[PDB]
Structure formats: C-alpha cells, structure tokens
Amino acid sequence: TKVTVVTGASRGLGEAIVKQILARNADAKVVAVARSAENLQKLEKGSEGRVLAVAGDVTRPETIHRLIEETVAKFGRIDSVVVNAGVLEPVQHIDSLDVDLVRRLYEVNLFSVMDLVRQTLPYMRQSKGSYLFVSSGASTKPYDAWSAYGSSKAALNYFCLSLATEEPLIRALSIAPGVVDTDMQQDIREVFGQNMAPDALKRFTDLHENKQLLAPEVPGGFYASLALRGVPENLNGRYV
Ligand SMILES: NC(=O)c1ccc[n+]([C@@H]2O[C@H](COP(=O)([O-])OP(=O)(O)OC[C@H]3O[C@@H](n4cnc5c(N)ncnc54)[C@H](OP(=O)(O)O)[C@@H]3O)[C@@H](O)[C@H]2O)c1
Numbered sequence: 484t485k486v487t488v489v490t491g492a493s494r495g496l497g498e499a500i501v502k503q504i505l506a507r508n509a510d511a512k513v514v515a516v517a518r519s520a521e522n523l524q525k526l527e528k529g530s531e532g533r534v535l536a537v538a539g540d541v542t543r544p545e546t547i548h549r550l551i552e553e554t555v556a557k558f559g560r561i562d563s564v565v566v567n568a569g570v571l572e573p574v575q576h577i578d579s580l581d582v583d584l585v586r587r588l589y590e591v592n593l594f595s596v597m598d599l600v601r602q603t604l605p606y607m608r609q610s611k612g613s614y615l616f617v618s619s620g621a622s623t624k625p626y627d628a629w630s631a632y633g634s635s636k637a638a639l640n641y642f643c644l645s646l647a648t649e650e651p652l653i654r655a656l657s658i659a660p661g662v663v664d665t666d667m668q669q670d671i672r673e674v675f676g677q678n679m680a681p682d683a684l685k686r687f688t689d690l691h692e693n694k695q696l697l698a699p700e701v702p703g704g705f706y707a708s709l710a711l712r713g714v715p716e717n718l719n720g721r722y723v
Contacts, residue, residue: 484510486558487710488550488603490541491568492526493517495665496617499703500565500710501526505533507704508711514554514561516541517568541568542590547602561606563710566596566639567617571667574628574675585631592635593642600646608652613714615706616643616657618722627683628675640722647720654714657722660702662690 487504491497492515501513514535515526523536535557539546554561570591573584600614607614621629622636643657662668672691676684690696 484512484558485562485711486512486514486554486560487563487565488514488516488554488561489565489567490516490599491617493519493522495667496660496663496699496703496706497565497567498522498526499699500567500706501530501534503700503703503707504710505530507707511711512558514550514558516546516550541595541599544598547595547599551602551606555606560610561603562610562612563615564599564603564607564612565615565617565706565710566599567706568595569617569667571629571632571670572675573631574671574678575631576628576678577630579678580631588631589635589638592632593638596639596642604650604653608650611713612653613709614643614646614653614655615709615714616640616655617706618643618657618659620659620661622657622659622722627680628678643722644720654716654719656709656714656718656720658706658709659723660706661697662687662695663699663702664691664696665699668696 489497489501492501501515504511504513512533514537515523516537518540520538523538527534527536537550537553570588573581616639618640619636621633622640640657643655647655671687
C-alpha cells in the first residue's frame with residue numbers, strides 16, 4: 484500500500500488528485516489536508532477507509548506536526564507528497580501591491596512547503612518517495628497583476644530543483660497543470676480580473692467561454708499516476 488499526502492484536498496485540483504489516486508489503485512491510501520474540515524470529513528466518509536482527513540492551515544507548523552503524527556499512526560509510511568495548496572491573491576499591479584498580502588501568499592505557496600518537506604523527509608527517504616509540486620505557467624510568464632503569485636511559483640520551481648539535488652534518495656517534480664476549471668479561475672473571472680488589464684483578463688474569460696478549461700480530473704490523473712508510480716529519473720528536479 485502506497486500512502487500519498489495531498490494538500491489542498493478540499494476542492495479543485497487537489498480533490499481531483501485524491502479521487503484519481505483512489506480510482507487508479509485499489510490499495511492506495513491518501514492523507515487529505517486543507518482547512519475546510521467539513522469537506523475533508525466527507526472525503527473520508529466516501530472513501531471506505533482509504534482517506535485520512537487532517538484539517539488545518541498548512542502555514543501553522545502544528546498542522547504539519549499533527550499531519551505526520553496521524554499519518555504514521557494510521558498508515559505507517561509516506562510514499563508521496565503532492566504540494567497542491569495555494570493562493571493567487573494579491574492580484575494587484577506592482578504600483579498598488581499590498582506587501583502584507585504578499586507575505587501571506589508566500590506563507591502558503593512556499594514557506595509552508597519548506598516546512599512540510601523538512602518534516603516529511605525522514606519518511607520519504609525510507610520510501611524513496613516522490614515530491615510533486617503544483618506550479619503554474621505564471622512561474623515563467625509575466626501575467627498582468629500576478630507578480631506575487633508568479634514569483635512564488637518561480638521560487639517553488641527552484642526549491643524543487645534544490646530539493647532533488649540535496650536529497651538523492653527522493654525524487655521531485657514541479658508540474659504546471661494547464662488551466663483548470665476550479666474556484667481559482669472563477670476568482671480570476673469574477674473578483675481579481677477587475678485589477679487586471681482588460682486584454683489580460685480577456686484571455687481567461689475566453690478560455691472559460693470557449694469551454695477550454697480542463698476538468699480537474701484530467702490533469703489530476705497525471706499527478707495521481709506520478710504519485711503512484713514515481714517520478715522518472717530524467718525529469719527529477721525539473722519543471723514541466
Ligand atoms: N487554472 C488553475 O486552476 C491553476 C493553474 C495553475 C496552477 N494552479 C495551482 O493549482 C493548485 C490548486 O488550486 P485550484 O485551482 O485547485 O484552486 P482551489 O480550488 O481554490 O483549491 C485551492 C486549495 O488550496 C487549499 N488551501 C489554500 N490555503 C490553504 C492553507 N493555508 N492551508 C491548507 N489548504 C489551503 C484550499 O482549501 P481550504 O480553503 O479548505 O484550506 C483548496 O483545497 C494551486 O497551487 C494553484 O496555484 C491552478
């Protein structure tokens with residue numbers, strides 16, 4: 484039985500990754516982490532004993548300590564960690580950018596990831612496990628008003644390369660999922676887009692209106708397969 488931790492499992496891509504893991508292997512176990520306790524408890528209930536819900540904010544080290552304690556007690560091992568929790572706000576031009584909101588975005592998208600990797604590494608070394616990071620095309624392309632988010636995914640890509648280089652017993656891969664039909668894209672269209680140049684926002688509303696947003700299960704099946712089968716050595720540390 485392989486045990487995967489998925490952060491951000493209460494909705495969107497991360498929820499789809501959990502479901503795809505359970506669909507693709509009958510023995511696999513998943514530890515689902517996010518703040519929304521009611522959603523996670525429903526995931527646990529629907530998954531026939533194969534999901535352990537751990538509710539909490541990943542930016543608190545108490546969450547991460549409890550996550551590892553409970554995973555080890557219930558399943559005894561960690562084989563894969565899917566780093567999917569993330570936030571997009573603040574979507575603001577640099578001339579208007581609220582640095583306190585930037586600090587919060589980095590807590591979620593990067594500093595909590597450093598803490599999660601540090602605390603899981605002893606178990607992941609034993610299992611030769613794979614760390615999977617959810618990145619974005621914004622990590623290399625400068626979307627208007629997204630300097631905070633895009634810079635944090637650039638930092639995340641580098642952190643994945645650094646991890647693979649320092650820890651040869653594990654594998655690490657940073658994967659952008661394309662554009663995915665989730666609340667984060669809905670937020671772009673209906674909330675954040677008023678801070679974006681009209682032409683820049685029109686790219687995302689066009690994708691929506693043309694029915695080109697991916698169902699989360701589609702990129703989610705690729706993370707699930709990587710979580711179950713491992714990262715291929717020729718892509719270790721890379722961004723794809
Ligand atoms: N087109 C796209 O949608 C797209 C494109 C490229 C990359 N991504 C990346 O895909 C990942 C998933 O985002 P999504 O599109 O699935 O949006 P989403 O549906 O809003 O899911 C975001 C997830 O992160 C969790 N989360 C946020 N802050 C958290 C925290 N402090 N502690 C724990 N969990 C937290 C949320 O759960 P709670 O609110 O329950 O905590 C939710 O489960 C993000 O890293 C995003 O950057 C998305």
